[PDB]
Design an enzyme around this catalytic site. Structure first.
Site, PDB file in Angstrom:
ATOM      1  N   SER A  49      34.427  29.921  37.306  1.00  0.00           N
ATOM      2  CA  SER A  49      35.286  29.401  36.205  1.00  0.00           C
ATOM      3  C   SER A  49      35.241  27.871  36.060  1.00  0.00           C
ATOM      4  CB  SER A  49      36.698  29.911  36.331  1.00  0.00           C
ATOM      5  OG  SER A  49      36.723  31.296  36.019  1.00  0.00           O
ATOM      6  N   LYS A 176      39.864  21.835  37.612  1.00  0.00           N
ATOM      7  CA  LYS A 176      39.502  23.234  37.313  1.00  0.00           C
ATOM      8  C   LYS A 176      39.060  23.919  38.603  1.00  0.00           C
ATOM      9  CE  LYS A 176      39.200  26.839  34.928  1.00  0.00           C
ATOM     10  NZ  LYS A 176      39.683  27.444  36.190  1.00  0.00           N
ATOM     11  N   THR A 177      39.582  25.122  38.826  1.00  0.00           N
ATOM     12  CA  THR A 177      39.207  25.947  39.993  1.00  0.00           C
ATOM     13  C   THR A 177      38.084  26.903  39.609  1.00  0.00           C
ATOM     14  OG1 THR A 177      40.872  27.476  39.321  1.00  0.00           O
ATOM     15  CG2 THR A 177      41.504  25.957  41.082  1.00  0.00           C
ATOM     16  N   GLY A 178      37.360  27.380  40.618  1.00  0.00           N
ATOM     17  CA  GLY A 178      36.361  28.442  40.437  1.00  0.00           C
ATOM     18  C   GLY A 178      36.298  29.275  41.696  1.00  0.00           C
TER      19      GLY A 178
END
Lengths: 236, 247
Positions: A49, A176-178
């Site tokens: 993501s 932003k996380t992934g």
């Protein structure tokens, strides 16, 4: 010129949680980056993501995404709402409407990782063909911060505001996380946290990734980088 | 066309603190606003530092503020607060309410351009007389809580007479709280203590962007003692928490 150095002052933050990972922290004014692991800082991993950042810019530039307050003409879902929740079908349909030709064109303009989008137009950021390094993430985010990507200034500003995740009187965190998933013990998944901090007149770009074979460890993707940036006096 | 409806459901948040004030809250748009006090909702008060919002937009649209990443340098001369004695970004100057940075922007904008933009923005009584670098601090400029909501709604929609880029720059500079569920954009204001018989005014204005809804708000209160300043955020915060908007 810009530079990178390997440090050991952050190694205690990884070993305490038995985490294999890397943190890259760049100070804009000095054009200097620091990392706990130069090899892993340059190793390319699937973005998961974190790919919502370029996908949101491309979606706005191509006109597939309507505006900041309404992704498509949930029905009243905002761009920030789609970036926060998983919104799996939302970014799938954005990628489908963009198409392979335009998606390939923009990832070349953005110098985004290995630029390999094979594996399916609506899931290539998870198929493990597209891969990007922590250093490439901070280079990409610095270009976004400066409005230097090949996109309108308005579209870059919209995505920058949609990425705000923490606000204080002295700083703004954009992030932003992934998470690729847990993978296996021999082939672990990857968890990311990338972003930047506007702190007084200084700007710090960051990219964190770690091996993950258990969702139990997922909170560490934010706690390790948060402790490093707190020890640096940047946030907290 | 737009309606203002007075309810008593927030009156305890005011009487518990012995505060004379007004809260205006509008869901989605300014078409329907809710308030504890219909008369005070439209009464015009000095904007104080809430004026930094239009002043920043005008600074950018006139080119006085060169761009998003403008740094306002401190010349090293004494400023009224230690937190202003440093170089500041636009967000920095807004978040610490650095009056001297905005006084110099106003001087460079000038009276003719300042009057033109306040007319375009329908900004309260649009009275800028008394001094280009202090009219919003101590002179005749007045704006109501309802007008603040209408102005902030126009900014949210990029409908002010300014570029979309400049409106977006100021909106990001106003972010004050972020959660997975919402972004709060807000600005405080405080005219001063005045006297017991003629108190000053304190403000908190802003909007809350959620996953699928937006809420516009404006709060003002009479204030004659700096010890009461925290209520300008605690009363509206308690109301919006009771409505499930924040928290």
């Amino acid at each position: 010129s810009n530079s990178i150095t390997e440090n050991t002052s952050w190694n205690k933050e990884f070993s305490a949680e038995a985490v294999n990972g890397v943190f890259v922290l760049c100070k804009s004014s000095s054009k200097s980056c620091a990392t706990n692991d130069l090899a892993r800082a340059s190793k390319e991993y699937l973005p998961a993501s974190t790919f919502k950042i370029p996908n949101a810019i491309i979606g706005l530039e191509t006109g597939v995404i309507k505006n900041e307050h309404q992704v498509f003409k949930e029905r009243d879902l905002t761009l920030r709402g789609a970036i926060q929740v998983s919104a799996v079908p939302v970014f799938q349909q954005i990628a489908r409407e963009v198409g392979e030709v335009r998606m390939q064109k923009y990832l070349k303009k953005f110098s985004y990782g290995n630029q390999n989008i094979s594996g399916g137009i609506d899931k290539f950021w998870l198929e493990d063909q597209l891969r990007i390094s922590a250093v490439n993430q901070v280079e990409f985010l610095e270009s976004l911060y400066l409005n230097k990507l090949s996109a309108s200034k308005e579209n870059q500003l919209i995505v920058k505001e949609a990425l705000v995740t923490e606000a204080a009187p002295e700083y703004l965190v954009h992030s932003k996380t992934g998470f690729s998933g847990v993978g296996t013990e021999s082939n672990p998944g990857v968890a990311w946290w990338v972003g930047w901090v506007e702190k007084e007149t200084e700007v710090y770009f960051f990219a964190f990734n770690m091996d993950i074979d258990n969702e139990s460890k997922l909170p560490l993707r934010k706690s390790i980088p948060t402790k490093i940036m707190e020890s640096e006096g940047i946030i907290g």
